[PDB]
Structure 1
Amino acid sequence: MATCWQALWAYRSYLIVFFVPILLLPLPILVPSKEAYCAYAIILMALFWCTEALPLAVTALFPLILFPMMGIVDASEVAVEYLKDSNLLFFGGLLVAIAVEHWNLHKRIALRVLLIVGVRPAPLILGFMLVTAFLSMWISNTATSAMMVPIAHAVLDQLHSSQAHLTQCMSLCVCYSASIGGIATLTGTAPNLVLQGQINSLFPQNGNVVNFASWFSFAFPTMVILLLLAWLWLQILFLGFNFRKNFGIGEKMQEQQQAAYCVIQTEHRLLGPMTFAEKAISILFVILVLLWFTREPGFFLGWGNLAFPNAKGESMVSDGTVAIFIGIIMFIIPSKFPGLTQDPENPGKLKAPLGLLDWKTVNQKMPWNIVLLLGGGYALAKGSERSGLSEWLGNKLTPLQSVPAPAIAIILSLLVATFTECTSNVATTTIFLPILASMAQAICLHPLYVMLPCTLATSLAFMLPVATPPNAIVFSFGDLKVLDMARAGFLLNIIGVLVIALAINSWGIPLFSLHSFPSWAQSNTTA
């Protein structure tokens, strides 16, 4: 009787696997098209992540057994989508983070951070949101998340150990600041450069109206307002809304934080002179970031364009090649260089010191499930283009002409920021942007009024682990749930739409003259 409601709650992860793909079978049966077959696979994988029925890397293997056997794409063509260039940037970025962790260099950094900032929950999070968003303005968002996530994990382990929901608030703040901060520069992310392509290709006489100096004046105050509104929402949701326990003001919080800071000062006064392994890894860490800043900056000419150019003039060497090249070097350098030890067998001959990385410790400490989880996001987005789901949704934005013009920028921002959680940012932008230019010419509206919110809203990807590859790197240590990401990222999409709709109707109107319909957007069909 009452034992039936006990057992079925224990079997809740086996009842979802058996009853979710049956309850969605009205979709690929009643509307038999190739677009409905791709929408079935998107809802299915999004429901297996929130309920956590399967492991995260097992659900990412579902495009390998769905897209062939419903006719979307061949099996050999869906297989080469799983190890792209951004997978190797996560691979080589975590080869450095393993050698930092193994030689106790993460205990040196996490004690030097907490001596500067201090044991306070909320100013420590804002200290990590500012450095991550500042770094993401100049390098790729995957290179920032692969570097800052193992550092933010070592600070939390040194905070909790020295004190005897904060670990989810700090893992999400590095995920979100790497995506929010990338929109303040023209070369910050990838869909920002597509808008400069589609403006110079659609309207060839614009006179360079979208350059580095005018995009920065429009999108940098949007980044700062969206950052401080994301810090307030992440603090209210996961930490309390007390706003005095968070900053630690008053008594009974100054008694603990003096007793927590005096442990950190003692723990830092031990672990004295640095070893040879810490001196060689910290030098290789500065060289790795200095080669990321100056590889292809865009506003001057880096070493990736002087040496190694292609026919067009861009770089054949990406950010992943610099990360693999440094991680290979760590297999070569000895760890204790004059370390002639003795071997137990054949006493005889001597033994060599191990390198800064050996394969035995790389095989243990590597998050191999994230490499598959990131690869399952590309195959889910590639099958969305090969079926025609992006083209079908793009041809539904056209009858939105009979809405007043300030409300076309809001409805379009919601539809792009929802749809970009499934697909890629670069492929959504190059499809939608020719459609919105032809729609703006028909209702005597200026372009870059429906194209500028369409470019900024592809970077508001805050819910699912397949959009914005920063979203999957934060699951490398298993202290999160995918429900906890979707619980914080839903209202952050609606906050981010109301900020973009503020920046396009105030301080976006004078520096672009959005009230004129200028003389480079005419055609033979307008007037």
Structure 2
Amino acid sequence: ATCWQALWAYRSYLIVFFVPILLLPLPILVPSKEAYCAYAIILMALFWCTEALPLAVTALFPLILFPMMGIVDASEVAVEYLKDSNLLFFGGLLVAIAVEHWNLHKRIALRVLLIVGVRPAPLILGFMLVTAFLSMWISNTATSAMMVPIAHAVLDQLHSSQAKHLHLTQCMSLCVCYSASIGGIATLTGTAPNLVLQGQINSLFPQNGNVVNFASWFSFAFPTMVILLLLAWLWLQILFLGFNFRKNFGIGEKMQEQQQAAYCVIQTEHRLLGPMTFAEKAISILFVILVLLWFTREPGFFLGWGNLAFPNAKGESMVSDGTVAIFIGIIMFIIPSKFPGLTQDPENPGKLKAPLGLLDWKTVNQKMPWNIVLLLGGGYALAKGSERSGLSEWLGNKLTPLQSVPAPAIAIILSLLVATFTECTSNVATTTIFLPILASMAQAICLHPLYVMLPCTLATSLAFMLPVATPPNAIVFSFGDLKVLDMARAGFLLNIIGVLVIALAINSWGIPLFSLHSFPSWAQSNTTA
């Protein structure tokens, strides 16, 4: 009896000791570098899902596993842990720390609740719609980095105004996370695999006639985005709240009048705030300026300030979104938090004292999620180890004996495999590798390309199970009120739903506007006929 409670109390130590031993037949029986990288991937996924170690400690495992298995040496694996996206997260969290420190987050959360109201499922739908609209035009990482702290502030105000809590918290966190990545598929400039697909079409089949452009991508990918967003909202609401759809929408007495009480509490808390202080006004202006600079830097469909000022030899911007975030975060240290804020010096009773800035270093040190910086870096290191061991090439060359399958099932199997492989590795390198293989495979069996290239492009964006794929999937672990098992349990079904929605969009309304029953003349080579 107690000898089983001793083993159940020690379960993390038993997992950490026994899971690496049980996977040893994969590197022992198959002596290859692809097998070693697969060992590292499966081990890190199991350690993240069981939470046997902290997240940031599991994230440091490529630093010891990749040099001593021979994939890549220590100096080359160490420069993967701070890229530009990781710095964009750091810079956005500086602004969020400043917003919370001067009580602007309470004012924003109370205005949001006074506009939308206190009803769980419509409030979640409103956050999902705003996040998806923002990630059509700016980066997915920046959208996540400004939308996650706002949703956390709104949830805290809603839970204090009514005095379940944890399940509504998990639902709103995952809804913002998934909306930031779902909304990026709708525009051609919304996420990087879309531009990789346009470049590979123009490179592999010249004289295609610019068949993939802004309007033809929007006409195909906007209804897919809207259908997938509504299905994601419905499934997350079912999984975390009940099957009721009546207390979810707050309908009926014993719900209608216990919401007027919380709404009156919210009105009282909003009235109890005074006028805006100097720090709140300065941070509001800087926040608006940061979002406006993110819209106009490199919009893709017209020419931004990052193309006019600061171009490279190809006309692209040398300045990125992380640069603008670090710029605003640095400016916050040099602006005084109160302008005639001259305090008499207590340890020097003849001098005055200047006020602190909108940010000081000890607040930033206490409030920054350093473990998420390490988690994002560990994901990047896993992806580079996957592309340097030859595992991505080995997984790409498995899609070639998929030829002996009828055509609507080829795309479904392909989308399943591409979403699953993207859960381990990156998504831009997979789109770089997989598209020539698929283009040759479709040229072999007299099938139109973009019948297999479009589902492969759309499937790299819809991966929802692990924090290693797509930096939004890491950013929701910042406030520490969500487990990885919640994300995997919600994301496993959402991958399958995304696969089915892609199949509906490619077998209906994708066939007319791309002429997918034709085998066009710009795809003919000397091998076809």
Q: Report the TM-score when normalising by structure 1.
A: 1.00
Alpha-carbon offset, residue 477 of structure 1:
0.4
Q: Distance in 1 between matches of 2:355 and 2:448?
A: 67
| Structure 2 CA distance for aligned equivalents of residues 19 and 251 of structure 1 | 54
- How far apart are the structure 2 equivalents of 1:12 and 1:258? 46
Q: CA deviation at 1:41?
A: 0.2
CA distance in 2, matches of 1:357, 1:431: 44
What's the CA shift string for 1:384-437, capped at 9, x where partnerless? 000000000111100111100111110000000000001111000000000000
Shift, 1:255, TM fit: 1.9
Alignment partners' CA distance in 1, 2:43 and 2:105 = 39
Q: Give the C-alpha shift of residue 268 in structure 1.
A: 0.4
Aligned counterparts of 1:345 and 1:143: Cα–Cα separation in 2: 43
Describe the superposition over 1:182-203 as per-residue Cα deviations: whole angstroms up to 9, x where unpaired: 0000000010100000000000
- Post-superposition Cα deviations, 1:152-188, rounded to whole Å, max 9, x if no partner, equal 0000000000000100000000000000000000000
Whole-angstrom distance in 2 between the partners of 1:468 and 1:128: 19
Q: Which residue of 1 aligns with 2:76?
A: 77
- The equivalent residue for 1:223 is 225
1:293 aligns to 2:295 (yes or no): yes
% identical equivalent positions: 100
Q: Distance in 1 between matches of 2:35 and 2:440?
A: 27
State the shift of 1:476 in Å: 0.2
CA positional deviation for 1:340: 1.0
1:446 partner SS? coil
- Displacement of 1:3 in angstroms is 0.9
Taking the aligned partners of 1:334 and 1:502, their CA distance within structure 2 comes to: 56
Q: Deviations over 1:291-327 (max 9, x none)?
A: 0000000110000000000000000000000000000
Please list the CA deviations of residues 325-363 of structure 1 after superposition, one character each: whole Å capped at 9, or x if unmatched. 000000000000111111112210111100000001000
Deviations, residues 194-243 of structure 1 (Å, cap 9, x unaligned)? 00000000001101000001000000000000000000000000000111
Are 1:54 and 2:69 an aligned pair? no
CA distance in 1, matches of 2:519, 2:348: 85
**How big is the shift at 1:440?**
0.4
Counterpart CA distance in 2 for 1:166 and 1:346 is 51
Deviations 1:412-469 (A, max 9, x none): 0000000000111100000000000000001110000000000000001100001010
CA distance in structure 2 between the partners assigned to 1:180 and 1:400 by the alignment: 28
Deviation at 1:52, TM superposition (A): 0.4
Among 361, 364, 381, the alignment partner of 1:362 is: 364
Q: CA deviation at 1:379?
A: 0.2
Quote the offset at 1:55 in angstroms: 0.1
Q: Give the superposition deviation at 1:254.
A: 1.0
**What is the TM-score when the length of structure 2 is the normalising length?**
0.99
* Ranges in structure 2 where 5+ consecutive residues have no aligned partner: none
1:444 and 1:190 map into 2 onto residues whose CA distance is: 29
Runs of 4+ in structure 1 over 3 Å off: none
Give how far 1:97 is off.
0.1
Instruction: For 2:18 and 2:343, locate their aligned partners in 1 and report how far apart those are by CA, in whole Å.
Output: 61
Q: Per-residue displacement from partner, 1:4-30 (whole Å, max 9, x unpaired)?
A: 111111001110000000000010000
Cα distance between partner residues in 1 of 2:32 and 2:22: 18
CA distance in 2, matches of 1:373, 1:345: 42
Partner of 2:137: 138
Q: Following the alignment from structure 1 to structure 2, what is the Cα–Cα distance between the partners of residues 36 and 354?
A: 54
SS in 2 for 1:331: coil
For structure 1, which segment, 87-96 or 343-352, has the greater mean C-alpha deviation from structure 2 after superposition? 343-352
Counterpart Cα distance in 1 of 2:494 and 2:211:
30
Equivalent-residue separation in structure 2 for 1:331 and 1:248 (angstroms):
44
Q: CA deviation at 1:272?
A: 1.2
CA distance in 2: counterparts of 1:185 and 1:261, whole angstroms: 38
2:420 counterpart SS class: helix
Output aligned runs, 1:27-426, within 5 Å. 27-164=26-163, 165-426=167-428
Quote the Cα distance in structure 2 between the aligned partners of 1:56 and 1:444. 47
Distance 1:135 1:245 in 2: 29
CA distance in 2, matches of 1:356, 1:296: 29
Match status 1:462 vs 2:461: no
Cα offset, 1:491, TM superposition: 0.3
